[PDB]
Structures are given as C-alpha cells and as structure tokens.
Amino acid sequence: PETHINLKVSDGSSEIFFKIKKTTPLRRLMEAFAKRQGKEMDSLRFLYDGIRIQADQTPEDLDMEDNDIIEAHREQIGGSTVVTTESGLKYEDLTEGSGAEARAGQTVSVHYTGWLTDGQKFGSSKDRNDPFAFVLGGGMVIKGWDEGVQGMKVGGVRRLTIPPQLGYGARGAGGVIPPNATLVFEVELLDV
C-alpha cells in the first residue's frame, strides 16, 4: 500500500511540502519546518482541520490524506487580527514589538521579505545581510510601506498585504513583479 504521504504546510506567506512515512510522528515535519524558517520549534503552533497537532501524533493517527494542509501559526498566542485600513491596505502583527512606536518623519530601519500571492519570493534584506532604512511617510518607498510601517514597535514583525495601487500598480516592476500584483511582505522593525 501507500506507505508515505505528502503534506503542505502553510504559514500564510508561503507553502512548503514535506513527504514523510504515515507512521512517522509529525515532530519530524514540525522540526524540518522550524529549522527552515530559522525558528525555534517552541514559537510555532500547528493546526490540522482546526485541531492542534501534537508532536507524537502520526498522519495515520489523524486520518491524514495526501496533500492535506497543515496551518503553521507564528503569531502571538490568543488569536490573530488582520486589519484592513481605509486605503485597502491589510496588515497583521505576528510579533508585537517591545520598543518605541514608529511615526511619520522618523527614519526607520527594517528587514523584509516579500512574496507574490502564489508564494513566489521576490526580495529579501536578509539574503544580503543589509537592513533597509528610510524616512517613514517621506514617499521614498511604496505606499503600502509608508502606511504599513507606522505604528510598529521595535522588535515587531508585521505582515502587509499591499494591493497594487499601494504597490507598483499596472506597471509592475522589471522581471520580478507583474502588472497588478498584490504584494505580501513580512517587515521586521529594527530601529526608529
């Protein structure tokens, strides 16, 4: 019979697939996911079908089927909120900062990774070890960012879903961003 199973894990920015034996405890898939996100397994919660997964449970215990989806939750405990502002911008605070709040006029420093909505990555400050600094609300970055980064706190990580009119519009950008692309970013506020 079919001894192995493919499972997708989504954290709401991208999807990754894992193939494991149906008798293997999900720990093996949870650890492979955590290490790949540069993340301690402690700070991740995993749901299947609305039910919390434990590390000693196997795909077979949970009647899993090939290509079933597991949700990986990185945000704070106690329930997430996605906020849609008047401009159509969406944001979700995954990690709430401890530091000082960002505000228009200040010069902020950030890391970011940005994806298209099909999970395809198009850019990252981490892949060059180079924080990005700009003046918040000074028109130097795309609009979703000027709106979206205000209110963050240092230490914070915020997911922005930027509709194209707050992005690169009908034009798109070079080879990477197509016309009319919605953009998903994770921005980490390093300094203000």
TrEMBL record:
<comment type="similarity">
    <text>Belongs to the FKBP-type PPIase family.</text>
</comment>
<dbReference type="GO" id="GO:0003755">
    <property type="term" value="F:peptidyl-prolyl cis-trans isomerase activity"/>
</dbReference>
<dbReference type="Pfam" id="PF00254">
    <property type="entry name" value="FKBP_C"/>
</dbReference>
<feature type="binding site">
    <location>
        <position position="192"/>
    </location>
    <ligand>
        <name>Ca(2+) 2</name>
    </ligand>
</feature>
<feature type="binding site">
    <location>
        <position position="191"/>
    </location>
    <ligand>
        <name>Ca(2+) 2</name>
    </ligand>
</feature>
<feature type="binding site">
    <location>
        <position position="131"/>
    </location>
    <ligand>
        <name>Mg(2+)</name>
    </ligand>
</feature>
<protein>
    <recommendedName>
        <fullName>Peptidyl-prolyl cis-trans isomerase</fullName>
        <ecNumber>5.2.1.8</ecNumber>
    </recommendedName>
</protein>
<keyword id="KW-0479">Metal-binding</keyword>
<feature type="binding site">
    <location>
        <position position="130"/>
    </location>
    <ligand>
        <name>Ca(2+) 1</name>
    </ligand>
</feature>
<keyword id="KW-0106">Calcium</keyword>
<feature type="binding site">
    <location>
        <position position="130"/>
    </location>
    <ligand>
        <name>Mg(2+)</name>
    </ligand>
</feature>
<dbReference type="InterPro" id="IPR001179">
    <property type="entry name" value="PPIase_FKBP_dom"/>
</dbReference>
<feature type="binding site">
    <location>
        <position position="131"/>
    </location>
    <ligand>
        <name>Ca(2+) 1</name>
    </ligand>
</feature>
<dbReference type="InterPro" id="IPR046357">
    <property type="entry name" value="PPIase_dom_sf"/>
</dbReference>
<keyword id="KW-0413">Isomerase</keyword>
<feature type="binding site">
    <location>
        <position position="131"/>
    </location>
    <ligand>
        <name>Ca(2+) 2</name>
    </ligand>
</feature>
<comment type="function">
    <text>PPIases accelerate the folding of proteins.</text>
</comment>
<keyword id="KW-0697">Rotamase</keyword>
<feature type="binding site">
    <location>
        <position position="130"/>
    </location>
    <ligand>
        <name>Ca(2+) 2</name>
    </ligand>
</feature>
<dbReference type="GO" id="GO:0046872">
    <property type="term" value="F:metal ion binding"/>
</dbReference>
<feature type="domain" description="PPIase FKBP-type">
    <location>
        <begin position="105"/>
        <end position="192"/>
    </location>
</feature>
